[PDB]
Each structure stands twice: as C-alpha cells, then as structure tokens.
C-alpha cells in the first residue's frame, strides 16, 4: 500500500495558548555532526523553526529554520549552541502550499554548515558551531522553538505547514548522499538517529495526521 | 518496510484538563449499519469508550466500549442512539498490556449487535438501535466519550491503551468476513468508511505515535 | 481495482411522493422465457417488488417480489401476465440487512417457475404464464411496481434495500447454470438481455450509488 | 472487464422543478487546497456549474464551471468563498458532445488558481481565495449550483453533459502530476478526498448511469 | 468471443401463409449414409419436422422429426424414401423450452436407424431405407416439411423452437463418435456435408437470429 | 474457428412484394449521438438505405444511405428527424461487388455529421439534426427504408449487397477511434448499442446467411 | 507428413471415347462472383478447358481455359453465360511440363474479369457476365468441357496436364488476397465453395492420383 | 559474510578500579513494558547484573540478573523501581562457558514478569513493578550495576562472560514471539528500542570485541 | 543487513589519564612487508598516530600517522624501526569530519614506502626500513602511540576520529590491488593478517562502537 514514510503531519497554525507540535519520545545521543532532512509544505513566508533540539543547559543546541524573501527566494537557517541564525539562500522560488525537500548538514568538527533544496546544494558557510559538541540528552521538537525542554514556545517563532519523511543522521552527509535522500524514487535512505515513523513521538495541540502526495499521487 | 497499518497511537491516561484523543477530520456519512474493528492493548480493567460518534442532535449516536471482569473475562459494549450500554462477554481472559483484535458489528436494520474477539464471535444481542439510522455528519473521536461534537470529555469514561489498524465499514460484516479482518497475515481488509492511516485525523493532548508489534516483531 | 459488477444501488425507503427507483433506458425485446438474478440486501420483511416489467397493454408483464415470514423464512414471488403472485419458500433464514443471491427462472413455453436462493433451488411451480409471451417493448423498473410505463408507483409495493449484479437472460437457465451465476468467485456470468452496469439506466428519487461488499471486502 | 472508473453519469438537462444532480453522501473535511479533475462531455456552450461545495455559513465555498466562446474556445472558471467567478481560457477548440479531461487546482495558501485541459496547463491566476480555508463539512453537488446545502438550484446555472472519473485531492497537484491524471493509459491516479465510484453519492432527478467511451471503446 | 457455432435460429411458430424456415443454398451430394446432429429447444409436444431433404423425384428423401409423449418421454423419428416415420423413444423426460442435443444416424447400406439424446444411444431400428441411396441434389430445409423443392409446407408438420450447432455427415457415425459430438466442451466436431454457420442458408418468414446459451452462459 | 463477427447477410435484391431485410428484436434507447459502422459489398450504384431507425411519431428518425457516382466516387448520406438526405463524397473509387468499411457519425448535440470510408475521414457537415434527440424506442431495419415501424418498404429505396460487422454506439466516435474500428486486425471494437451477432434480429424475405471474406480468407 | 493439399491429379490425354476428368459430387450454390485458383502443369500449348460449370439450362455457365502463344506467353481465358472466351495474356513464358499457379477472378456484379499467374495480376477485362448470376446447381467438371451435365465432352476442348490445390470462392478475391493464395509457404488459404481434397469428386477415365512437387520436394 | 548480529563482547572480569562494561549512547524513552533478550556465555555461577537501567531519580529502574544453583539450575532475576530481585528458575542445566539465549519480559501495566531460556518459558511472576512506568531518559549499562548514571559499580554485582544479539522492545513480547527471537535460523527479529550493533554504545575497561559462534561456526 | 565491515569505532579525544584506543588480542607474526588500509574520519589537523606496532625490544616497529596542512592537503606518515616519520602529501583537500580511505604500503625488502588516498597513489619514498624485518610478536594499538607494549601513551600523539574497515596484509599490495581495496562496492578484500571485525581486539577508555555511513547510507 502507501509507504509508511509518506505519512505527514500538518501544523495548522499557532496562537497562544495553542502550539501545535511534535516531541520525540527518546532524546538524542551526544553528537558532533548532524544532518536533518525532510519534505515540507510551507504555509507562510515569515521565519519559522522546524527542528528544535534542547538540553537542560542549552535550549538552543540545534535549530533549523526558513523564510521566503519577497522575490520568493528560499532561505534556510541554522543555529548551533545559541549562535545567531546563519542563513543561506537557495536559487529556487518558493510557492507557499507546495512541497520541497530540504536538508541541513552541520559539522561541529570543522564548523561547516551546508543546506540543500530538492537534493541540490545551495551553498555553505563557515564558523557555525566550530568545535561544539551537542551534549547528550537533547529533546527534539518539531514545529515550535523550545526555550525550555519540550516547551516555552513563542508563536512568532513557530512553523506552519505540512511535513513528512524526517530523517536525521549523526554524520555530515556528502553532496552525493543528500541527493539520494531527496530523490522520491531512489532507495529512500533512512536516518540512523531519527527515522520518520520508526521513532515514536508525541503529538499535541491539534496537529493533523495525513498522507503526503509529494512523491506519489 | 513496516506496513503503514502497523502505526499505533498510545492513549497515556486521562486527567482533567488533559484528555488524550483523536478526532477524525471528515465526519461520517449517514449509515444504517456499522462495523468497527481494531487492535487494542488495554491499560485498565475499568470501562472505557474507544469509538465515539456524535452529531449535533445526538452526542451518543454510536459508542463502543469495554471492561474486564475480576476473573479477567473481556466484555465488549455498544450504545446506539443513546440506549443503555449493551454488553456481551467474550470467552477470553484479558491481560492488561497485551494485544487483542476486537470488532463491533451493528445493524440498525434488524437491530442486531454482534462482537468479536480475535476474529471469533463472542455472541449477539437483539434490540440495539432497531430501526435507527445514524444521521449524516457524525464526528468520530477515539479514546474519549463526546458529550459535545469533538468535546465534553469525562475522565472516568476515557480509554487508555494502545490502538492500531482501525477499520470501519458502513455494512454489517459476516462472521467469516470478520475472521479475515482480525487475521494478521490474511489479506488485511480495509474499511470503506475509515481506513487506518488513510483518513486524516487530529491528534491532541499527548497521544503517542508509535508502531504496533502485535502482528510483526 | 473493484469490479464494475460490485457497484450497488441503495433504495432508501419509499413515501409518497418520493419513490426511489431505477428505469432501464432500453426496453426489453419480446421474450418467451426470462431469468432474473441479483444480489440483494433486504431492509424490510414485508412484500416488495424488485424487478417490474410493463408494456402499454400490460403493466404486469413480469414482476418479481419477496417477503420474509415471522420465522425468517425467505419467500420469492413471481407474477406473469397479471396472474396472482406465485410464491415459493426457501429453506433459508433471512436476516434483514444481510446479502443474498436470488434468481427467478420463468418459462412461458411450459409455464414453469423456479426460484433460487444463493445458487440453490428452493422449489418449482407449474402454470405460471403458461403459453404467455411478453410483448416486445417492456420497460424495466427496479425497486418500484409500475401501474403505468415507468410510473404509477405504490408505496406499499416498493422494495427497500441494497442491490447489485443484476443479470437477465431471455432463456430459462438450468439448475447447474444458476449455481455458477450465484457464485462469488466463479466465472461470474453476465446476462444477455441486461448486464449490470453494461446497460444504462435512469436513477431517480435519491437512490444511492455505492459498492457491494458481499463478494469482496 | 470494464474498469469501474469508466462509469459515467449523464445530466440530461434542467428545467424547474427537475434538477438532475449528484449529492455526495459524506461531506468534505476542512481543506486549504483542493484539486478537482474529471472527464466531461459538455452539451451546451453556456455557463454551467459542475462541482459545487457548500457549508451552512457559505453556499459558495468552492464552485467550478465552464463555458465555450463563439470561436469554440474553452473557458474554465472557479469561485472561492463567494468571490466572483475567475476564468482562464484554454487554447483548445471545444466541440459539444465530445470528451475532454479538465482539472481545477486551487491553493488557499498562496491564493493561486490553475486550470488544465487534457493534462496541459491553460494558465494561472492570483488572488483567488488567498488566505481562505474551506470550513469542515462541505456538501458536494455535481451538475447543479447550491444556494443551500444540497439544494436551491437555479436552471440557468446547471450543467448538462456526461461526466466520469471524478478525482479530488486536498492538495494542489503539480503540472506534472496533473498530466499523469488526465492520461487514459497512465497509472490513472485516484483522488484522496473523493475517488470516482469509491465514495457513495445520491442520484436524483433522472441522471443516467452509463459507461464512458473516452478512454476505451 | 462467442464461438460462431453458438449462433441459434428461432422458429417462432407457423400459421399459413407464414412458414418460418431455413433453406440451405447448396444442395446435398448423393449419399448412402447420413448423420444429422443439432441442439434443439422444443416449443411443442406435437410432431414437428426438423431436417427435411427433397429432390425433384422424391420430396421425402430424408426427414427427421420428434414429439413428446404425455409422460414427457422424447421420441425421435426418421423417414427415408417416403417410408413411414420410424420412431425410437428415449429414456429422457423433455421439458419444453429446455435444450437437448439430438442425433439421427442412418445407413442405407444396412438399413439401420439409430438415434441419440445428449450423446447417449436411445435404441436402433432395422429396415429403414435399406438399400436406398439418396439421389444427388437434395435440397435441405429446416423447420418445415417440403412437399416440393423448398416449399409446399404444412403448418401441422412444422417445428417450432430454437436450434443451433447443426452438423451433418455423409457417414453413419459410431456411438463413441456421437458422444464426442454432443459434448459441449469436447472438441466439438464439424459435419463434413453441412457445418453450422459454415454453409450459407436462406432465412425466411421471421426466423430469429440469436445466441444459444446451452453450452456457455 | 471463424470469428462470429465475420458472419454476413446477403440482401439479394428487392421487388414488390419481396423485401429482403433484417429487423432488430430490441428497439434502441433514446440517444443524442449515434455512430453506425459496418462492412458492405454494394451491388448497385443507385441510392439505397442501409440503416433505418423509426419510432411511431417519426419513421425517419435516423437513416444512412449511399450511392456511387458515374466516376465511381462513393457518396455517404444521412438523414435525421426527416431532414433531407445530407451527402458527403469520399475520395475512393467504388467497384460494385467489393468490400468497404463505412461509418456514419452523428451528434445531435452540435449537429455535426461525419462519414468515414475504410477508417479514413471523408469530410464533415453542419446542421444535421442539430438539437435533435431520437426518441426512445426506435426500431432498426437493415436493407429497407421504413415508412412504418418495421414496414412500409419501397423498392427504389432498398439496398442490395452483402453486410457484416454492424457496430453501433450511442456516442459520436472520434477520428482515431473510427480508424481502430475499420481495421481488420486491430482490436475490432464492439458497439455498445448494437454489436453484430450479439443482439438478436429477425431475418425475412430471403436474406442469405453466409461468411464475409473481407478480413480473412 | 505431406499435406493433403499436395495431392495432384494427372490428366493423361484425351481421345474419343476416353475422356479423363473429375466431376465434383456436390453441385455449386447460386453465385454472383467466383474465384478459381489452382496449380497446373500444362502438357500442350493448345487451348484446353480446366474448370467447367454447367446447369440444365446452361452448359456454359462458367468455364476457365488457357493456351500458350508461340513465343511462350501464357493466355488465360474465361467464359460466362455462354459469352465468347475472353482472354488476357500474362507477362510470363510458359514451359510445358512445369508448374504455375493460376487464378481466375470473376464478378457478375460489375462484370469484371481478372486473371493471375503466380500470385501476380496479368490484367483485367470489362463486360464479362455483367449482371449475370450463375443459377443454383452447377455441376463442376475438371479437365473436360461439358456440353451436358457431366458429359458431352469434345477432345479438342480437353485439358491435359497435372493439377492440384484447387480452391474456389464465391467472392471476387482482391489482388492482395490472390497473392497470399498462390504463395507456397504462406497460410495457404482454402476455398469456401470448393477446397481441394475436402470436397469429394468422381474420378474417371484413367486420371492419375499422385503428389505435386511444386511447393515441396 | 558474518552477520553483524554475531558480534560479541567479552566481559573479562571485574576488580576495583577496573569495571569492564558498555554504556549505550542514547538513553531510553519512557516505557511501561520492556523485553530484553540476548545470547550469553556465563563465566561464574554467582549473581551478576547484565542489563542495568538508571535515571537521576532512580538508579534501579530496571535490572536483569542471573545466577546458577549448585545443581546447575539457571535462575533469572529482575528488579523494577528498586524492588527486591525477583527470581524464576529454569528447567535447564547451565555449564559455565556455554551459550544460552535469555529473555526477560516485563509489563508494568499488569505487573507481570516472565523469563525465557532458549526460546522456552521458564515461568512467570506477579506484582513486579505493577503500575510502575520507567521515567524517560534511562541510561543503559551492560555488565555492571549502576548506583549512579553510568557509574557507581560494585564488583560483586558485575557480570562476566560473553554477550551478543542484545534486542530490546518497549512491548511485552508473547510466548510465541520470544521463541522466534531465540531461534538461530529464524527471521532473527530486531528490538525496536535497542538493536544490537545498530545503536551505538561506549566500550570501557577492557571489554573484548569478537565474534559469537553460538549460531554459526 | 549491514555488513559487519561497516562497524566503526570512534576515538572521542585524548586527555591524561584517559586514552581511548584499541589493542588487538593476538600479536602479529614476523613480517618483511606490511600493508595497512582503513577508512578514517579525522577530527583534528594535527599529527596523530593511527596504527602502532611494538615489540619488547622496539616500541616503534611500525607506526602510521597523518596530519593536514593549512591549505587542507593530506599528509600520510610512516615510521619503521624507530626511523624518523616519513611523509608523503596527497593531492586531496581534507575536510575534518569527512570519510577517506587510506593505505600505507611498506616493503622492508627494498625499503620502499607508498601511500594511497581513496584508492589512488599519492607518491612513494625510498630508504624506509630498508633491510628491516619486524620481529615476531608485535602488539597492535589503534588510536594511540605505544612507548611500551600496549601502553605509555602520549596525548599529543593520539589520533581522534572515526575508523572502520581496517585490513592488514603481510605483503606489499600493488597499485591496482590497493584501488580494489578502497572501492566501496568492489569485492571489498580482507586483510590476511588482520581483518576488521574478524580478529578480536580490546576496547578501552570510552571508544564508541557504531556504524560507518561512508559506503552505505
Ligand atoms: Ca530557545
Ligand atoms: Ca524562543
Ligand atoms: Ca525569542
Ligand atoms: Ca455523550
Ligand atoms: Ca460523557
Ligand atoms: Ca456521563
Ligand atoms: Ca402494476
Ligand atoms: Ca401497483
Ligand atoms: Ca395495487
Ligand atoms: Ca450558491
Ligand atoms: Ca445559485
Ligand atoms: Ca444566482
Ligand atoms: Ca413431403
Ligand atoms: Ca408435407
Ligand atoms: Ca401431409
Ligand atoms: Ca420513411
Ligand atoms: Ca420510404
Ligand atoms: Ca419515398
Ligand atoms: Ca459446353
Ligand atoms: Ca463443348
Ligand atoms: Ca464445341
Ligand atoms: Ca544500583
Ligand atoms: Ca550497585
Ligand atoms: Ca549494593
Ligand atoms: Ca613509541
Ligand atoms: Ca610515544
Ligand atoms: Ca614522544
């Protein structure tokens, strides 16, 4: 039938005190590199945090985000160890309500940041979490930005849209590897740290469970 | 990989004001018969409502429930058009925390009620919604008993446990058909009104999305 | 996918001036024998006319009907050239809201009538339209009894329930042939005069187009 | 045999008080995007509404329509949240009585409207239901324009012709996806919200059930 | 599709001056033996001539006929060189309007007559055309008894019913051979003198061309 | 063996009171479009009516005809609702006694007429039965022109020759579809309203039943 | 083994009162067209009649013949309804004692005559039996010219040589069809009126039965 | 080659300050049930803790252990929420230095404990962690008993021997499931919480990485 | 599943008294040539010793190392019989945290040293251990540089990063052989002296056992 990876979650919209989000049951192990990929259907052009990882000592261990410029250009952001959000624009025009595959590749070892839109590299950036190692026990939240383990959400920092096929590796994937990940008919690799629908997560505040039609109709 | 039908939802436990539940996005069409089957892992012996269907004029259109006696005997209940809960005991000893397949078959045409535990018939009952037709637009909630469309939940009426493979037909399946439905390796039929993971639903109050290991390890 | 023969029509219920029914676009050719088979899910125990054939000179050319006794016994009736309804009971207990296959075999040549329930013979009767030939141009209506071409319906003569797989031959099928017709996984023969979903018909007064789950779930 | 998707409905013609139409049994879930495709054989050049969706608070939630210019040019229209009918002409000459595949793609997220004729894009339009979300519970009627849930039809707004293969998604399909939908021998995708012959509907006022010969003879 | 051998002809009924019949275009060669087999659906119990062969010098060269007794017993008759009709009864009860396979085997060499009903021998008779040889040029008529080449029909001698699979050999087939001929799924042998639908014939006076459902539904 | 579609009928010649023809047992349903195709072997150059459809109110509902000019050019004619015979010449030289495939495509919806000779389009014509709908119950006669249901034939309007593979659709086939119909080795499509040898017809006045050798020797 | 179609007959030579010939047991049905093909090995250059057809009223219904010019050119002749022998020469040099395939195609409908040598057309001729129809009951003789049914032979009109594969159709085959007939390894079509070795014939006056080595050695 | 599941770890022996052990990188999610299976080669008969799970608030969340009686009987122990070690003896004689498959199945829901030796059930016990839920974030250590997260080891509580194929589920496997797990050539199921060699772990104090020869030589 | 060769070890980082390393259980046999290949993910640019071999009489029998220049150039070093570290730079830019395949080929017979990066030769060097033979009994340590059998580690000489697929031969592989070794999808050759995961080794001081994603995702 439908592949379990085609399951999607809808993040309707946020307005205090309702904060639709997902919280992964099991925290992350300590890591020195991290690659987060997923298919997203953005609802707004304004900045929103998609993947948020926090520990008791640091609520901003690792946070991915995006926003669309006026011309429609996609902009992927990343923040490590509470640094400022680093952005890299992608040569692709975003149409709210449409599907796109996005990856954020980070390496604390050399401090390099690289983002991808639909399997292609948009560019890279230096000095992003250089020498930093995310402490063991990070809690992951999707759709909201944590200011506290599993909470302290701000509505202007939430992300609304549809999401599916979230795959996370504790390695910094290569340009060729990422392309095989974004591919709809490839082998469809699975993250070793988090594999969509293979790692239980908590659903709260009205997120909608449905089916993504990006890859298959 | 894993079949999308093996996805399960955990209903942690209920305590005002937190009521873990699922609400199906699309309401049901009018029906004269209804068959609801699913795999459940009960957490408590006390009565709990699993499948709740309500319309503006009647919050108790159709409600399934269960409870376990002291000797461990399973008891499946059904309520139609706000009748009293009708119960039929099953010749099977329930162990909280273990998986079981259960079906509730109702026919407003002749007013017959029949329940099944693991593909086998437990017994039938007469005069249950005889002549009744559920009005179009019923809202379905899983894990809580509605006293209002999508709400008005009571904690002593909630149902805690794990659930998966929810299949619903607007027909009254036969004894042979039900057996093919409960089978783990059969053809695994899909409900025509609601097919698990094929009909979007809203998740709220901390339900946990995971994977059922009843059929496959 | 689903076989087009599994399409079903629901006849909700009749109450002046609403008469749910089907009227076949093309009239029947003259015949001397006729076999009408179909799958039915009866809603009431009282007499109802299923297949009605009328010509300008005779509104009661050929009419099939059924009713269920108090003990649940099925009774199939037939009327030819405005004779009285001839009935033959079947050794099967009917449960309103459940599916059954039924055939009416008539031969004006020898005047014999034979009915079948689920591919098996219930019995036969003599002197039913003996020597009669249905005149060319008969109009066929399903669910209502014509007192006029395509009309003049009476509520107490209507038939409510679900129907599918209507097959009609201008020959008097044999006992062995009938059994192959009723079979769900056989060759599934098609009528040469009327073949379900292959001969267009008019739908009126709220009949519901759906899918029969008798043969396949 | 014939694929169940080749079943067609004929909308004979409308004249008070007879309004041939179809009403889907189950209402639609709330949506933010919607794609409606189907094969049509138009009988008149004048404007007619094909797909009509209404809720208690808004009878004009979503309505598709078409008309043919004097030179024969096809014009597909769309109306969202009671806006004015937006039209986009297609570079194709229509011959009444012939088959054509048509899709209407709408996205309330960015407010974009796009129409397709025979799998090809005719053009797009902005500001059509921008920011609008169709409320849960929409009733769908085919062939007539609702001014009230399931009724309030106007003859000059009806649509006569033959229709089949109605597929509806709660997503805004892409240009490439649409082409795979229109194709007669492709995979023939099925809508996730409404799939022709898989979602029961009520037939009234003389619609004719037949077989479409567009794809296969 | 349907095998051309399943084509059937209906002989409605005879009443001066209308005599439904078939006349084979090509006359028969001289013969000393002849076997005529066919599937028939008799309409009346009274005597009727099925196969009639006549030459200018003898209108009664070879004529087959049948009639049913009161008890329903079949009786096959044969007449050679204007002898009296010889009859042989068959241990089978005939039901007018039903199909049966019948063969008439004649040998002028030894003067033996043998008839078969459904591939089985009913009995034989001596001194029937012993030493007789049908002269070349016999005209064959089906359904009527010739008193003149291709004419001079008498209504009380006509045969009404349905007929198909007419096979004629200029040899006297064996008991085993006949059984293979009557078989519906055997090899279905074809006559060497006349092969149904392979030897053109003239149709007159309202015979009806249709399809036999004896062998296949 | 030989395909049942290769059966042919010979229309010897007409001379009062003998009018060789065929009359289809079952009348046609009401239609708004009609396509009639068949293989013909014309015997004369003068006008002859091939397909004649009549109702009690109109004996000239639909009539096809042909004639050959002096230069041998084929001319196909059509008449709807007693209009004048519309003719379209075909760029092909006819040799009496030879086989040709011919189709007449009519659409009352737009009033267009199109004819084909051997799968190719000869041309089209406007305003032919524009807005007309053939009333239900049309009687079809082949070889003669009805001035009364099933009768009132005129010899100078009869058509002599050989005919086979008569296929009739209640739709107006496309140019590509027609080509697949005329093809001898294609899929050989079958008409949905009338399928040669699949819809019984009455044979009268000496028509000859034989086998067409157009497609196969 | 050897195909029965390779059987050949030798016509030694004629001299009163010995006339080697073949007479077909069964006479021909009435025809309006006729195609006669066969493989011949001519022994003399002088005119000889190969295929002779006669009825009581006309001994020269249809007669084929040939002769070879001094330069060796083949000349095929035909005579219908006692017309004069029409000849068409073939661009091929004949060597007495060698094999050749020959066809005579005649159409009384348009009066056209066409001959073929080795599957290729030699030419055609008009006004040959135009409007003529061979009466039913023609007797066929091979090797001699009848002046009376089955007799009245003249030596100077006989034809000596070897012959095989005689195929006769009551249709006027096309140029392409003829070529498939002459081919030794094609499908080897069989005549529908007379098929070599499938239609019994009388052998008299010393004809020799052997095997043709034209097609296979 | 060798299956990655056949990798084994040797726990040499413990003596302050050297404590050979394994610490899983990623902590466990909250659980209500837990099944831990693995292949072990015990070195001593005295009590040793194999699987130790601790959280900041409770160092004895879940601990498995074993010891061998003097007669050689195996004894499997379990401790939940700092209860006393519960033991169940197995009807199998242990030989130090040999391989055995062992599973510990615990369910906090009903408080039942069950142990298995080589895929077979040894017995069960009640009231073991009844109503207890292990808090999220448990740290897992193999070979040593934690008195503090990842430390506070005691020599007399260590476990020496060889271990491999550690599989852990957050469900309470059934008797039949367990047997499929212990099987060497079965499907070899993998734990969903911890899968040997698929979930990184820290190795310290001289553990030896080698290859298990229990299943394959 | 995953190939056992994809197992990797992480060397976290070194700081007295913690020295993460691996010590192979079985010492090496005497050798005159040695080839050491493995996949490495370096964490620092500064010099680190990867493979260290020592005997009681010589702690620096054979030691491999690497460092990265400021421009990112890779530099592979080798030391034999306590010579000075010989370095050869590779035309490849190293990115800390990324995977690379590296081989060190040494031959005491001719004293030649050759290094490879990703299966390609970087260059060679002479006079490196020329005439030297490593004495039997060498102890191998990975990640630390021995100054004593299995110990005497210095932090500034340690190597941090991830490593897998360690293969060692007592022969000096050729350029072509090396390339087949580095290949991810080749035959993946195994060392004859040490084969990753096939020769047991001791793990100490927090090395992490995980899975390499260089070759497969
Ligand atoms: Ca924060
Ligand atoms: Ca924040
Ligand atoms: Ca903030
Ligand atoms: Ca309630
Ligand atoms: Ca309540
Ligand atoms: Ca209550
Ligand atoms: Ca009536
Ligand atoms: Ca009535
Ligand atoms: Ca009445
Ligand atoms: Ca409206
Ligand atoms: Ca309106
Ligand atoms: Ca209006
Ligand atoms: Ca007679
Ligand atoms: Ca007579
Ligand atoms: Ca008589
Ligand atoms: Ca007329
Ligand atoms: Ca006329
Ligand atoms: Ca006239
Ligand atoms: Ca003559
Ligand atoms: Ca002569
Ligand atoms: Ca002469
Ligand atoms: Ca402890
Ligand atoms: Ca302790
Ligand atoms: Ca202790
Ligand atoms: Ca050293
Ligand atoms: Ca050192
Ligand atoms: Ca040093």
UniProtKB/TrEMBL annotation, chains A, B, C, D, E, F, G, H, I:
It is found in: Secreted. Gene3D superfamilies: 2.60.120.200. It comes from the Eukaryota. Ca(2+) 2 binds at residues 145, 147, 154, 157. Ca(2+) 1 binds at residues 59-60, 145-147. Its main location: secreted. One of its GO terms (molecular function) is metal ion binding. Transmembrane segments: none annotated. The keyword Calcium applies. Binds 2 calcium ions per subunit. GO terms for cellular component: extracellular region. Residues 5-215 form the Pentraxin (PTX) domain. Keywords: Calcium, Disulfide bond, Glycoprotein, Metal-binding, Signal. Disulfide bonds join 37-103, 90-122, 184-215. Belongs to the pentraxin family. This is Pentraxin family member. It comes from Limulus polyphemus. The lineage of its organism: Eukaryota, Metazoa, Ecdysozoa, Arthropoda, Chelicerata. The gene is LOC106477591.
